[PDB]
Enzyme design. Structure first.
Site, PDB file in Angstrom:
ATOM      1  N   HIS A   1     -49.394   5.839 -16.146  1.00  0.00           N
ATOM      2  CA  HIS A   1     -48.746   6.789 -17.047  1.00  0.00           C
ATOM      3  C   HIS A   1     -47.664   6.079 -17.876  1.00  0.00           C
ATOM      4  CE1 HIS A   1     -47.310  10.779 -18.372  1.00  0.00           C
ATOM      5  NE2 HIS A   1     -46.061  10.393 -18.136  1.00  0.00           N
ATOM      6  N   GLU A   2     -46.762   5.393 -17.189  1.00  0.00           N
ATOM      7  CA  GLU A   2     -45.677   4.665 -17.823  1.00  0.00           C
ATOM      8  C   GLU A   2     -46.152   3.669 -18.842  1.00  0.00           C
ATOM      9  OE1 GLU A   2     -42.741   5.599 -17.831  1.00  0.00           O
ATOM     10  OE2 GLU A   2     -43.266   7.046 -16.290  1.00  0.00           O
TER      11      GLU A   2
ATOM     12  N   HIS B   1     -46.863   5.045 -22.195  1.00  0.00           N
ATOM     13  CA  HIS B   1     -45.695   5.143 -23.094  1.00  0.00           C
ATOM     14  C   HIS B   1     -45.379   3.742 -23.674  1.00  0.00           C
ATOM     15  CE1 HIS B   1     -44.405   9.287 -22.096  1.00  0.00           C
ATOM     16  NE2 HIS B   1     -44.495   9.021 -20.794  1.00  0.00           N
TER      17      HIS B   1
ATOM     18  N   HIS C   1     -46.574  12.285 -24.220  1.00  0.00           N
ATOM     19  CA  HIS C   1     -47.131  13.128 -23.176  1.00  0.00           C
ATOM     20  C   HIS C   1     -48.343  13.878 -23.722  1.00  0.00           C
ATOM     21  CE1 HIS C   1     -43.022  13.173 -20.925  1.00  0.00           C
ATOM     22  NE2 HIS C   1     -43.786  12.159 -20.528  1.00  0.00           N
TER      23      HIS C   1
END
Ligand SMILES: O=C(CC1(S(=O)(=O)c2ccc(Oc3ccccc3)cc2)CCOCC1)NO
Ligand SMILES: [Ca+2]
Ligand SMILES: [Ca+2]
Ligand SMILES: [Ca+2]
Ligand SMILES: [Zn+2]
Ligand SMILES: [Zn+2]
Length: 157
Positions: free
Chosen positions: A111-112, A115, A121
């Site tokens: 997920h990180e 970014h 998101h």
């Protein structure tokens, strides 16, 4: 977004929570998802500054985005840019794992890293970029994730 599709990353410190090998596994495995569908390429370096700087910390840890101890906030990465940009920070007050028990490193890292590469998101509950931690035995990206990144960096193939 990043100009060059060739990026370096470096685990600056390691959470003792896991044997460091599994830590490298969860990371490299995180980077693979994104590499599996875009022209992006990743080289981890063991010393010196890298584009994506990875570290496990707590509370005030330099940047103006301090952690809240166990629970609550788990991790935050920085959008593409030099220095702090693309950097990803993990909350050491969390009990990081290589399994089904709470806060599976791989999953959060994936997920990180999303970014780190530029993504925001997702409103798709089934996307990795969705802003709520959940654990899934298989962890592949959603159509949403792929679509998201490919419009940025194009496709692999
Ligand atoms: O999005 C965030 C911060 C959050 S969080 O710490 O709960 C969070 C939630 C999920 C997450 O990664 C994952 C995404 C989907 C499934 C598993 C892990 C990573 C961080 C806390 C504040 O609201 C958004 C989620 N960081 O990148
Ligand atoms: Ca950086
Ligand atoms: Ca926390
Ligand atoms: Ca910990
Ligand atoms: Zn931070
Ligand atoms: Zn997030």
């Amino acid at each position: 977004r990043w100009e060059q599709t060739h990026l370096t990353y470096r685990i600056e410190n390691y959470t003792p929570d896991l044997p460091r090998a599994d830590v490298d596994h969860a990371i490299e495995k995180a980077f693979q998802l994104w590499s599996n569908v875009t022209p992006l390429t990743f080289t981890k370096v063991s010393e010196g500054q890298a584009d994506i700087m990875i570290s496990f910390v707590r509370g005030d840890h330099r940047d103006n985005s301090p952690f809240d101890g166990p629970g609550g906030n788990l991790a935050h990465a920085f959008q593409p840019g030099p220095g702090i940009g693309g950097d990803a920070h993990f909350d050491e007050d969390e009990r990081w794992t290589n399994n089904f028990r709470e806060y599976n490193l791989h999953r959060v890292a994936a997920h990180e890293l999303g970014h780190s590469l530029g993504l925001s998101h997702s409103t798709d509950i089934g996307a990795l970029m969705y802003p709520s931690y959940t654990f899934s035995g298989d962890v592949q990206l959603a159509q949403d994730d792929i679509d998201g990144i490919q419009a940025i960096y194009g496709r692999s193939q």
